Amino acid sequence: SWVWNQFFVLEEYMGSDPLYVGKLHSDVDKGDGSIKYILSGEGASSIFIIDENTGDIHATKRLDREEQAYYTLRAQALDRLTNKPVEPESEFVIKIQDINDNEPKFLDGPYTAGVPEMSPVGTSVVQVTATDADDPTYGNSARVVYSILQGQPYFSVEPKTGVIKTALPNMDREAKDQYLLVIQAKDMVGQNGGLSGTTSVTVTLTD
């Protein structure tokens, strides 16, 4: 079945005029005001208000998707005289639409890892993980690309997975036993304008 019972409103609005969310409407409504539209549920009468005559919903404050990403409300349509329902009460969702306002963050960083000296090229060393609190299903605001800022050509990193691998054969611990890498994670899939985060990786060569 098609799912239609959802509205959205953009997060982090800084204007003074309340944002318009949408309109509750019964097709029984003849435009004569005899139906009263009533809002209940999450944020109802506080964050979200309704005009009982027109069904228009507004949001009354700046909203943060990363605080709560959506709200589940209920809609009623009552006859003004009798207060009896003209429609069955229905749930509906108000979705908080994402903007890219969070940087990728390496929450478990910094990293340390060991790898045997003289490992073959392509040996996995460690997987680093940047988390991006934005919406991974809308645009690229939470779609991250990994890169090595400092550490090429000795190591490589898989751009989508954050797995660091050895890149040079025949590393000698006697010559150099430790490497200090800087890894970047950048959203908007690394495109210009993306937000970024970084972490350090200390790689020790083990015998």
Enumerate binding residues for a copy of itself (CB under 8 A).
1-6, 8, 20, 22-28, 54, 56, 75, 77, 87, 90, 92, 97, 137-138
Do residues 46 and 13 touch, judged by C-beta distance below 8 A? Answer: no
The answer to the question of residue 184 lying near Ca ion (CB under 5 A) is no
> Contacts with Ca ion: how many residues (CB under 5 A)?
11
Taking CB under 5 A as the criterion, which residues in 116-135 touch Ca ion? Answer: 132, 134
Shortest distance, CB of residue 131 to a copy of itself, whole angstroms? Answer: 20
Minimum CB distance to a copy of itself, residue 91 (Å): 10
Pick from 153, 165, 7: which is nearest to 72 by CA? 7
Type of residue found at 18: P
**Cis omega (within 30 of 0) for bond into 110:** yes
- Nearer CB in complex with a copy of itself: 41/109: 41
The answer to whether 29 contacts Ca ion (rule: CB under 5 A) is no
Name which of a copy of itself, Ca ion, none residue 14 binds, using a CB cut-off of 5 to 8 Å depending on partner kind. Answer: none
Closest CA to 128 of 153, 159, 102, 150: 159
Is 20 or 122 the residue whose CB approaches a copy of itself more closely?
A: 20
C-alpha distances out from residue 63 to 8, 57, 103, Å: 11, 15, 18
- In Å, what is the CA distance from 202 to each residue of 11, 128, 158, 174? 38, 12, 17, 17
Site residues for Ca ion per CB under 5 A: 64-66, 98, 100-102, 132, 134, 141, 187
